[PDB]
Design brief:
about 130 residues; mainly beta; Immunoglobulin-like; four-stranded antiparallel beta sheet; about 45% strand; immune system
């Protein structure tokens, strides 16, 4: 019956940073491995990052590795996704997911629990010089 809620989405200029959080209900949070997934406008959802029960093991999607960092704080029942040097291609609704039994890269369909999603828009001022 674990409930997940993401926060932190917003409109950011390219090169900008953004920090997302995903908080879980109850106090059995350490029993869950978590992941971040994202859905770009009208596309299939893709893997972003994953973190094990103890933050010991982490995985990143190839398009985000090095720019993004996933972390966890058991005292705040939360996982975070720190995004640096954002690109227009990072525009998506970001979702967090939880599972008591599996951790690793990908495995979207494996996760048992899902958040609501938080929107991340990476946009310039749309100024065109011709």
């Amino acid at each position: 019956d674990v409930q997940l809620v993401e926060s932190g989405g917003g409109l950011v200029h390219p090169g900008g940073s953004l920090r997302l959080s995903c908080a879980a209900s109850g106090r059995t949070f350490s029993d869950y491995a978590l992941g971040w997934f994202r859905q770009a406008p009208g596309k299939d959802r893709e893997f972003v990052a994953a973190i094990s029960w103890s933050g010991g093991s982490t995985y990143y999607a190839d398009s985000v590795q090095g720019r993004f960092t996933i972390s966890r704080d058991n005292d705040k029942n939360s996982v975070y996704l720190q995004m640096n040097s954002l690109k227009p291609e990072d525009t998506a609704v970001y979702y967090c997911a939880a599972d008591k039994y599996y951790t690793g890269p990908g495995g979207e369909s494996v996760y048992d629990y899902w958040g609501r999603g938080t929107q991340v828009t990476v946009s310039s001022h749309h100024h065109h010089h011709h």
